Symmetry: D2
Subunit: 151 residues, 4 copies
């Protein structure tokens, strides 16, 4: 059943499956990141960035990417980066997240870059920025992570 | 639609995905997310499902923030004119306890209302009355 | 030879003499162990039903616009939430400020500042606390949250 | 009667007597108007723009700025970052414009210690509405005492 759906509801679902398809093709991937397709990558320099293409799926009634999704993008770049600095087997959880929505998210993609400010045995402070498919800063933020210790 | 994609995890998920996408075309849900994630926007509730869980089997952070984000936004448009809307500017969020249980509840209340900027705070909770997240936000009018 | 220097009076206008007077008051008090730091001395901070610090809005605390320096406002808030957390802790444990988030609402003015604080979460590793700063009118100067680390 | 109240220097240890000495200098440099405010005057901050765009504010560390454990008061740290971020914002603004600290966020990392603190701020965004800036505080070793962001409202 797909009869009634318009253009926008067309790919807003097409991609939902390219992802549910991609999430199957490999574990360790989470749902929320699977659909939005927040692809994490590493350049030939060793750098790291979590950019993602903008689709009607991520916008709001103001037609700009959801601040909350931009939040999640930054949270990821920062989360995945933190985990890298941890011994094998360990994980971190976001303690505090502070975002500064500089400019509106629009265009092809958003790009997120993170950087460790200070790493402690328990708490890790990180800064990070989200740019546009061009270069303007969409958001800037920092946050704190804790080395998970499940009871 | 070669959507012949599968296990049970995906079974349930995609069921909400579509139960939710076709709840938007029937225009009962504002956005795709307020529906895709059954946001009981009316206070804002969040049905805790594997669709909203990170790899560590708990409500995803970006989510708990979006939940708080939304609650806060509405809360600021209730005090705004028909031709003016509030856009998040800043979002401070403290994660206190994992997002776990049947659902998440986010209550937001304005701390200060100015001609250009409004300050708001609010929390998120689990069904058993536990406090999940807590943060502040600043919204500019447009 | 400070006394030689304290001829700052030979020219001192009224507030010049009144600011100096209050400074020496606080110090004396600092000796009578009324405070822990000189910061508390000169500022004159005095501390639900019990936890709310108050700071007298004099010239020693204002900025080039005759309102309390947001710096000091934040320092006051940090004090309210700071000693508020110390109370909720065993003799063997203490806490240092980890994260401080503040939203400035109205210019700090009047005869004093009053900040009330409350624990938003008491966990093994950190204690999150929210709090607000008020005028002698009840008007909100600033609202902010804070995270405290246990040591 | 500030004089008859100098029974403070007759039960005052080196530190206490050392403090007031600075304080008097402060207040003294205050009336000569070498400083607009008492806070800046009593803390002796030195501010300046760097070759790059960033802004710098250093603050001498003395007993006057420490907390019960001879560590720079978290408040003076915040107030410093704020000061740096402010002067930064204001230097990038027209003569007929000004800015006021709207939001402030800080993450404490290492105990402020040594002989002086060095806060460094840089603009992250420059709207005509609000100005988002960012900064860091360093010890005299280069160790990061604290990191934080601040949004400023334009007037
Ligand atoms: C960040 C954090 C770990 C800081 O430590 P803290 O505040 O001292 O938390 P504590 O360790 O004291 O308590 C954690 C509680 O969560 C519980 N918990 C449940 N599942 C857990 C898990 N998988 N790992 C760790 N704790 C878990 C702990 O058992 C404990 O329960 P309790 O209240 O009965 O003691 C804590 O605030 C937290 O868990 N925040 C949630 C972060 C989050 O949900 N992030 C999502 C995006 S990654």
């Amino acid at each position: 059943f797909l009869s009634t759906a318009n253009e926008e509801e067309k790919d807003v679902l097409s991609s939902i499956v390219d992802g549910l398809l991609a999430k199957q093709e490999r574990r360790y991937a989470t749902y929320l990141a699977s659909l939005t397709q927040i692809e994490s990558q590493e350049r030939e320099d060793g750098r790291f960035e979590v950019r993602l293409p903008i689709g009607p799926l991520v916008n709001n009634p103001l037609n700009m990417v959801h601040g909350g999704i931009t939040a999640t993008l930054l949270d990821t770049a920062m989360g995945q980066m933190v985990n890298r600095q941890l011994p094998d087997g360990q994980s971190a959880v976001t303690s505090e997240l502070n975002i500064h929505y500089v400019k509106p998210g629009m265009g092809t993609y958003l790009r997120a870059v993170a950087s460790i400010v200070h790493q402690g045995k328990q708490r890790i402070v990180v800064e990070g920025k989200v740019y546009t498919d061009q270069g303007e800063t969409v958001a800037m933020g920092t946050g704190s992570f804790f080395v998970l210790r499940s009871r």
